[PDB]
RNA sequence: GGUACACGAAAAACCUUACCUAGACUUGACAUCCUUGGCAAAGUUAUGGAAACAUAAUGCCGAGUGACAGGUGGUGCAUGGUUGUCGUCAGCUCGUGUCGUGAGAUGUUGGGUUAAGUCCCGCAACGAGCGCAACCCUUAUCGUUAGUUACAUUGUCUAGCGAGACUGCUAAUGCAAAUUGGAGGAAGGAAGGGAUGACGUCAAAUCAUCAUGCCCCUUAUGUCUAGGGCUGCAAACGUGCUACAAUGGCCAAUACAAACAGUCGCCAGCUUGUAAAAGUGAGCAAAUCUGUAAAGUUGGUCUCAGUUCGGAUUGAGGGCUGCAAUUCGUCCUCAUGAAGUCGGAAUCACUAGUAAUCGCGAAUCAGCUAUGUCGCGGUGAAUACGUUCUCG
């Protein structure tokens, strides 16, 4: 086992003034290169002003609010043919998983160029389509179906 | 004079011994000779050699030694030929190896 | 499997045994392979002198071999007949243009040096002396000299087969784990009639506090 | 009135000079602009976040010389030099600079490549 | 490729092949140097080149020019795999 | 066949590339250090003995 | 098996080399002792030879003599030494004493406290040893001695010394160790890391480093030499590399390290060369001179497909080392472009400057598809809710 693990701090970006944007730029990073992902995300921002003219922060928070999952799933088995257990997860991991879903689903689509695909991903997340809201809805629907296990668990 | 800029450079594989030698030279030169700027530290050329421990394969456990080589530098403004006469009797140890201008 | 206790403190608590330098890796190898021959000749050919160690000091075609032996006269010989002999083997193993100027000096309280005690253990064991009583006599005589704890262990054929019957002896404070310890270590190959006997001796020679660096 | 400092993040030194000047500060690093030297990212923004919690480039010139490391280490070194320079200019800044944990020399540096480990932490692989 | 007098021979095999070529051109002569390349003069003779066990004969022809002498002598056999 | 390798290594070679490096004390023709002419394990044993002028324990 | 599989071996065209074929040699290639002496020792050129070699000649060394020399021949189930794993895991024991007829137990147990048998309270136990701890090195801050070959819109910097951090102070709670909180402070409660690895286990590995008893060989299992083979080939596994593409392909401009190494070498600059390179020719025994960082930024083209991705395979022409590149080196240019659009059961690594990823240096070595290893710096993450399961 181990004890409780402290978390390293993440600094907000003082240009759009949101630390969730910093977690965006962190998760969408590959190879350990802030510059390339930074240009990608800022081009996506410029596209947000370009089509569907609206505050990028507003569509950002709307996408975060729609994609966030209400409940999580935890494995607690007894014997063969294991059974799941839905438990409660704090908001930090909830937004972390929402961002992870946005990142993974963005790089799974048509419109080959990253700029338009990630922009369409954030647009769909704001508008509640099957791109990512489908996954959250499914993971919610497996929850509260076997909630009898959730009530009596440990 | 007839021999300005005696640029003696001393190099050794030990530090405290070289420090003792340079202290002795700076104290002895502190007599007749003048205008001798202090000791000059140098980046201490360093290398590391790595050797496997076991006579047989055992590659995952190997150690490594290190042959340190410290380095200082002196410059003498002028010979003051009597000064080199006093210099003839320094008898520096073998560990410090000298190299003048 | 543990590290040699000599090497861990060597170079930071113990001065080197051969201080010299030459042209970069041109014949420094030659000088090392040569003076190790002198070292081996001292430790091998003359058992009766109990040479603790030898110091080799070369600088550009000069050599001075300081020696520390319990009994200097055997190296000296009678009316200096042996000193000239030993120095001429040293010459013929070093060349002819290099001055030699050897010196021999008795070592005060030699019995606190693990080298001579290990050599005595090798001599006793090779002579079919029962190992346990030889260990006890040597251990008592060493400890009585006013030193700290000792560690003597012996492997090999202890008068027969099934060598996994090895005896070890530990008699007080001898802290390997302490770097500032002033510990001594040696090793000899007691070539018994049944094979090879390796004797190892650890000597604790007091605290070495405030040393700063090597002596 | 020159104000001094020093920063040493990730094998990168940084000597700074600050003077209260007429303009907002006229950022000049290595006699050239930061915009073309450092790519326009949060890295160029990081140096004035010490200033944000203070008089934000009211009148404080920037005269910095930089050596060593890459550019992020350069940015950390110059940031620490700046915070030291403000501390030298005014002691009253300890309570607000240290609270945000801007000083104190983060000292996160590439470790030594330990043998048996590919990048000082990675084992080759496991096989039974 | 040698790039300077590229056609290379051990320089000892020249004398006997030149002699024989001007001495009624005897076919069987024992050679071991797989090191050599062939000059244009080489065409005409046979040689008992050594692979590592014994001598195998090779007849040189003008059809090829420039290829190594020893390449005509295979040294390693084929698979000959058993069933299991 | 080891001692004959010792004597062959010493003899002047017919070709510049004929000769190779080898420890003087023993004939291990592998891992020999040109900077010391001494085998890696030989180097280790002599360094624990301390014949080499400069040897430490690596902390670097 | 973990603890073997980019291992011995930090470099096999010849040697290496221990194997095979063939050529030759025999107190022998090499060593001592016995007897006898004092001038050749090597290397060089014809000569037959592929070459050991027989020649003929130039310029410490010899001649007869047995113990024998020699063995990479065997026995790690005789071994010394060395090393791996449990494992940097917290464990292993001893002296006196007591209990028990006895093996044995009591210390080492009980409570809190930690990474720890770390400490302290209780205790028929009192103490002690190995280990752990701290003493070492190294990075993180400041002060000083020093100033070049650094630096010099200058005190950076390097390397020596010293200070600093010692639960130091405060709050709580505890008997006390100690725990947590706060202030100061660069760092606060083993600061990051290295070096250091107990008794022993696995008859663990190594007789092929070395030494090594015993056995075996000796005009041969020893010696030298030329060629080959250690690089094969129906197949399978292991560790790596390139990828399978637009986070990208290509083109032009473009700046940013650190460490290490180098006078038979690094190679500046220049010329020729589509290029491998070739030539000229400084400086550099070196903080001087040299060994152009790549990622990154800007601009442009490419527009999603076995492709302007991908590079094997194959053919040719050049280059370099080396006497020499067919087994059996490598680089450059031209020519074609396999297969692969993310991969089955299953698995591995990692808690930060780490992973990933970008390059740079060194070693053995003249040459090395080392993509290996050993090191240096650039950019630069997520999460640890928690121990129910799983591994030990
Ligand atoms: Zn050796």
From Swiss-Prot, chain A:
Alphabetic keyword roster: Ribonucleoprotein, Ribosomal protein, RNA-binding, rRNA-binding, tRNA-binding
InterPro entries reported in the protein's UniProt record: Ribosomal_uS7, Ribosomal_uS7_bac/org-type, Ribosomal_uS7_CS, Ribosomal_uS7_dom, Ribosomal_uS7_dom_sf
GO cellular component: small ribosomal subunit
Entries under Pfam families matching the protein: Ribosomal_S7
Biological process (GO), any one: translation
Keyword Repeat attached: no
GO molecular function annotations of the record: rRNA binding; structural constituent of ribosome; tRNA binding
Presence of the UniProt keyword Ribosomal protein in the record: yes
Coiled-coil ranges from the UniProt annotation: none
Family: Belongs to the universal ribosomal protein uS7 family.
Subunit architecture: Part of the 30S ribosomal subunit. Contacts proteins S9 and S11.
Biological role: One of the primary rRNA binding proteins, it binds directly to 16S rRNA where it nucleates assembly of the head domain of the 30S subunit. Is located at the subunit interface close to the decoding center, probably blocks exit of the E-site tRNA.
Protein name: Small ribosomal subunit protein uS7
Taxonomic source organism: Mycoplasma pneumoniae (strain ATCC 29342 / M129 / Subtype 1) (Mycoplasmoides pneumoniae)
From Swiss-Prot, chain B:
PROSITE patterns in the record: RIBOSOMAL_S10
Key words of the record: Ribonucleoprotein, Ribosomal protein
GO cellular component terms, A-Z: ribonucleoprotein complex; ribosome
GO molecular function, one term: structural constituent of ribosome
GO biological process annotation, one example: translation
Record's function text: Involved in the binding of tRNA to the ribosomes.
Oligomer status and interactors: Part of the 30S ribosomal subunit.
HAMAP family named in the record: Ribosomal_uS10
Family (UniProt): Belongs to the universal ribosomal protein uS10 family.
Protein name in the entry: Small ribosomal subunit protein uS10
Protein species of origin: Mycoplasma pneumoniae (strain ATCC 29342 / M129 / Subtype 1) (Mycoplasmoides pneumoniae)
Lineage, opening ranks: Bacteria, Bacillati, Mycoplasmatota, Mycoplasmoidales, Mycoplasmoidaceae
Curated annotation (Swiss-Prot), chain C:
GO CC terms in record: cytosolic small ribosomal subunit
Keyword match Ribosomal protein: yes
Alphabetic keyword roster: Ribonucleoprotein, Ribosomal protein, RNA-binding, rRNA-binding
GO terms under biological process: translation
Molecular-function GO terms, alphabetical: mRNA binding; rRNA binding; structural constituent of ribosome
Coiled-coil region(s): none
rRNA-binding is among the record's keywords: yes
Domain KH type-2 residues, every copy: 38-108
Subunit structure, interactors included: Part of the 30S ribosomal subunit. Forms a tight complex with proteins S10 and S14.
Free-text function comment from the UniProt entry: Binds the lower part of the 30S subunit head. Binds mRNA in the 70S ribosome, positioning it for translation.
UniProt record similarity statement: Belongs to the universal ribosomal protein uS3 family.
Name of the molecule in the record: Small ribosomal subunit protein uS3
Organism classification: Bacteria, Bacillati, Mycoplasmatota, Mycoplasmoidales, Mycoplasmoidaceae
Portion held of the full protein: 3 to 217 of 273
UniProtKB/Swiss-Prot annotation, chain F:
Cofactor(s) recorded in Swiss-Prot or TrEMBL: Zn(2+)
One GO molecular-function entry: zinc ion binding
Keyword ATP-binding: no
Cofactor note (record): Binds 1 zinc ion per subunit.
Binding-site list for Zn(2+): 23, 26, 39, 42
Recorded coiled-coil stretches: none
Keywords from the UniProt entry: Metal-binding, Ribonucleoprotein, Ribosomal protein, RNA-binding, rRNA-binding, Zinc
Pfam families named in the record: Ribosomal_S14
SUPFAM superfamilies documented for this protein: Glucocorticoid receptor-like (DNA-binding domain) (SSF57716)
GO cellular component: cytoplasm; small ribosomal subunit
Domain of life: Bacteria
Biological process terms in GO annotation: translation
Function, as annotated: Binds 16S rRNA, required for the assembly of 30S particles and may also be responsible for determining the conformation of the 16S rRNA at the A site.
Binding partners and assembly: Part of the 30S ribosomal subunit. Contacts proteins S3 and S10.
Family according to the record: Belongs to the universal ribosomal protein uS14 family. Zinc-binding uS14 subfamily.
Identification of the protein by name: Small ribosomal subunit protein uS14
Native source organism of the sequence: Mycoplasma pneumoniae (strain ATCC 29342 / M129 / Subtype 1)
Lineage, opening ranks: Bacteria, Bacillati, Mycoplasmatota, Mycoplasmoidales, Mycoplasmoidaceae
